[PDB]
């Protein structure tokens, strides 16, 4: 099982007739899905995975960049000295699952350890031809519509004590997020999240974070700065770019005694037309929103966090703020289990 890089191909259940923009890309860039795929459980097998150096991530990144670049039509695009003006009609936008598959002569190894921390050896290993269907949801702060951990919440980081490195939280229970632009200001919207469900989730996340900072008070705090796409929970719903003030979800402290025990939490949101692109450095202006209700209820299955560094002058308290921005971490949260291996 020697590991090497290999050009992947995709499989999806896209509809050849759909105008939905993910369906159009997959129809001419992927192949049909194997209805009953094979999966061989390897025995007495131990291999080393490294989610932070996975070429599968870089390959999926090039795909979704290519998708978005030939799909979303901004009225004006500003890309380093160049400025483009074109027609900007509204599009049908709803991501579909995309499987990633090894070519002939290669395979994919899937790590089935349910407490796998992202790096190091794995003992319960499978081999598949393709990954599970991954929805390429472009978002920040919150990871939407992903796949859950199978037992407990898991904290993943290339080095957890290195504040320069992002932290990817993977939940084991979904937390709903219902976002509506009600059919005043046509750019005004909001997202409701269950107060009890979210606060109970923060309790369990703090405990998992507490394992790498034993004792220590765990704190969640709002973003420290940056462009609107990362200070606010940013995501795309029906082709429109939502920007939600997430302060209400990162404003709490938890000590080794706070882990010891309806109504919504509704964040104010804006639908922006002037967006800061994530694929390349540049600014794109889109048309004002469509008329009618703009509703999409997604599943929060992960969090992107950045820990504050420096000697805390209080004594001992770790502060975690919502991060994101590099969409490779979004694909990473789904591709951490897999690696490509040449059949040998």
């Amino acid at each position, epitope marked *: 099982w020697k590991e090497a890089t290999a050009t992947l191909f995709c499989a999806s259940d896209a509809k050849a007739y759909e105008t939905e923009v993910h369906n159009v890309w997959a129809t001419h860039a992927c192949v049909p899905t194997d209805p009953n795929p094979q999966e061989v459980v390897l025995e007495n097998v131990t291999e080393n995975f490294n989610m932070w150096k996975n070429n599968m991530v870089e390959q999926m990144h090039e795909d979704i960049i290519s998708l978005w670049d030939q799909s979303l039509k901004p009225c004006v695009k500003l890309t380093g000295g160049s400025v483009i003006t074109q027609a900007c009609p509204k599009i049908s936008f709803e991501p579909i699952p995309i499987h990633y598959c090894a070519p002939a002569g290669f395979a994919i190894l899937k790590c089935n350890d349910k407490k796998f921390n992202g790096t190091g050896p794995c003992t319960n290993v499978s081999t598949v031809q393709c990954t599970h269907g991954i929805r390429p949801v472009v978002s920040t702060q919150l990871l939407l519509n992903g796949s859950l951990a199978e037992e407990e919440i898991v904290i993943r980081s290339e080095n957890i*004590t*290195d*504040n*320069a*490195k992002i932290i990817i939280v993977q939940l084991n229970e979904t937390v709903e997020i219902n976002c509506t632009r009600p059919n005043g200001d046509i750019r005004q919207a909001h997202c409701n999240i269950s107060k009890a469900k979210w606060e109970n989730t923060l309790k369990q996340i703090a405990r998992k974070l507490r394992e790498h900072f034993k004792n220590e008070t765990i704190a969640f705090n709002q973003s*420290s*700065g*940056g*462009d609107p*796409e*990362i200070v606010m929970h940013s995501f795309n719903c029906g082709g429109e770019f939502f920007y939600c003030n997430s302060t209400q979800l990162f404003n709490s402290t938890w000590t080794w005694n706070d882990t010891e025990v309806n109504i919504n939490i509704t964040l104010p949101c804006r639908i922006k037309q002037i967006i*800061n692109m994530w694929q390349e*450095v540049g600014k794109a202006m889109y048309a004002p929103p469509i008329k009618g209700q703009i509703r999409c209820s997604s599943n929060i299955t992960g969090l992107l966090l*950045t820990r*504050d*560094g*420096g*000697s*805390s*002058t*209080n004594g*001992t308290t770790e*502060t975690f703020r919502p*991060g994101g*921005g*590099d969409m490779r971490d979004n694909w990473r949260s789904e591709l951490y289990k897999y690696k490509v291996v040449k059949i040998e």
Partner: antibody
Amino acid sequence: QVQLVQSGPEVRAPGASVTVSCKTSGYSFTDFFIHWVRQAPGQGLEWMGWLNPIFGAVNYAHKYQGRITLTRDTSMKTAYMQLTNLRSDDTAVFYCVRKRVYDEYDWDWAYWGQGTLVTVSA
Amino acid sequence: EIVLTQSPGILSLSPGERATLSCRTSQDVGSNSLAWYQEKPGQAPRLLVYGASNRATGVPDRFSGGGSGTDFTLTISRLEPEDFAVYYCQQYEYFGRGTKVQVDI
């Protein structure tokens, strides 16, 4: 050749603000963090924060969180640091710094700016 | 947090002698993290050693870094007049409070 050029020395009164620029050349600006280090006469080298040029992501040290703001101008390949509510003992040399090799360890600071001396006096 | 105790604080030596600088961290940090810097008045600090033992570009073989668990050593084999300065221990964003070598013919 990687070059970090900072702005000239500044004199400020207590309570005033100061902004320091770091003009960058020699590499792809958006691929490296930019950190800022404070160098006081008897306090010897202190990290203040970093800015990720991809969007404007920042990390502020606890000691500076209320008083520091890190911004950038990717078009001009220039990083900026603003400090407010300057105290009598805030006199220091501030450095703009970058890491050694792309994609690798973030704290091996091989490239420093020449430094900007900020003198706080009434 | 991670405190880095550098000992001794002052180090008086003559050109030609050997200077052994100590640094001890509060936690185990492996053998490929700790870095050393040279601070001379009038110029920016200079990275000397990274990953505990790797010499940075442009530094002579007189400078040698060692150590693994919590004890690290920056050694200056022969100590030239250029080498009299203050040297800082670093891990992550944290710094030792420095150790100065002084000219004392």
